[PDB]
Amino acid sequence: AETTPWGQTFVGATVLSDSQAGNRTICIIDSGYDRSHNDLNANNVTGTNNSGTGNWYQPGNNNAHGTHVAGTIAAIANNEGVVGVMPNQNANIHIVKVFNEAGWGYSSSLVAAIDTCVNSGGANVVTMSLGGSGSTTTERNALNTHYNNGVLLIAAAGNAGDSSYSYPASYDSVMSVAAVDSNLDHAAFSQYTDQVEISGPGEAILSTVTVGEGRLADITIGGQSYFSNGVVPHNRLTPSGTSYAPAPINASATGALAECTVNGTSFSCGNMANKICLVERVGNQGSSYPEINSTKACKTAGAKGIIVYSNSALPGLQNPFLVDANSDITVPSVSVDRATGLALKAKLGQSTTVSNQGNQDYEYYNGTSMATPHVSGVATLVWSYHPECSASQVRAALNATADDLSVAGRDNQTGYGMINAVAAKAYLDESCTGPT
C-alpha cells in the first residue's frame, strides 16, 4: 500500500495535478539522492557530480537527508511507499550533492553549487535545506542576480530555536521557510526572524531515506494497521559520556490495550503488566524534553508496549526526543497525534500490537529542512501552470495566498503563513500579478 503523508494533503499537493511539471526544473542542493530507491528511481532526475562528494546518485552511508528532502518533492505514485508533491514522474529534478556523511564535502562554495544548478541543471527553482550563520556580499550579490535573472531561491530558516539569521535563507533574494506541525502550530525549533516568509510541514514528516537506513512504527488492532494515521517510533536517547546518543528500541509487543489516566501533571496507570499502555502526553518539547514522563509512567506500571498521544496544547503529530537518562524505556514505544489517541480509546481491552522496526526505506524527520521541500515542491507545481510568470511573481503569489497562522498578519514565527497550492494557483490563474 501507499501512504500520503499529512504534509502533502495540507499544502494542497493532493488536489493539484503535476501534469504540467515537465516544463519546470527544481534543483536540490543537499546530501545526494538515492536513485536506487523504488520511490525515486524512475523520476526525470539528473545531477552534476563534484570531486569532493562522489556520485550524486549515491548518498553513501548515514547521509540520507537529501533523499528525504527529494521524497517530499517527488516520491513517485506507484502503490508503494509514499508520494511527494509532484508524484507522477513529470517534474524535472537536478541534484547537486554538497554534503557527505562527514559534513560539507563540496570542493567549492554554495554559490558554485547554485551556479551548477542553473548552468548545468537548467534550474527554475533551487531548494536549499541547509545554511550557516555567516553572510557575505559576494553571496548576497550572486543570489540576488540569479533571483532577478528568474531563478526562485528557497531555503530553510534553521532549527536553533532562536531569532538568529541563517543564510542563504536570510538574504532578501531567498524565501526563508519556517516549520509547523500537523495542527499548523509553529515548531518550537524553527528560528523566528523578520526574514521568515512562509511556513510548511516540518514536524513528523515521513519520507524516503537511503534504502535500509530508515525506521518505522506501526500499531495493529483487529488485523488493521494505523500506519496511515501517522505512528512515530520514539526517538530514544540514552546517556553517552557527557551527552546522549540514539538507543532505539526496535521490537514488537502485543497485549490488551489499557490507558494510563492523567490528571494535570499526575499519573494513575494502575497495573500495566502484559498490556499496551495508552497515555496522553504531559508537557511538550521545547525548553525541556518531557516525553520521558508519560512514557516512564507506563513503563513503571509494567507496560510491554507504549503509545503516547498528543495533548490539547500541541495536538498535532509530534516526533520528540525521548531522553531516557536511566535507560528505563526498554520496550517499544510510539507517538501518535491527539485524534489518533482519542480514536484508540474505543479499542481499550483489545489485543494491540505496537512495533518499531529498523532496516526500512522510509523515516520520520523533523526540521525546517522538511518544510522547505514542501514549499519548493509546491512552488514548482504551481509555477508549472504559468511558466511565463517570473520567479518574483511566483514568490509574491505564494506569500499573498498563504494561510495566515499565529497572530494576524506576517509574523517572525510563520511568515505569511502556511503555503497553499490551490490558492496560489488561483492567484496566478487570474494573472501573473494576481487580482487587480
Binding site: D30, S31, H65, F99, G103, W104, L110, S129, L130, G131, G132, G134, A156, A157, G158, N159, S166, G367, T368, S369, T372
Partner: peptide
C-alpha cells in the same frame, strides 16, 4: 557550513 550544515543540513537543516
Amino acid at each position: 557550513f550544515x543540513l537543516f
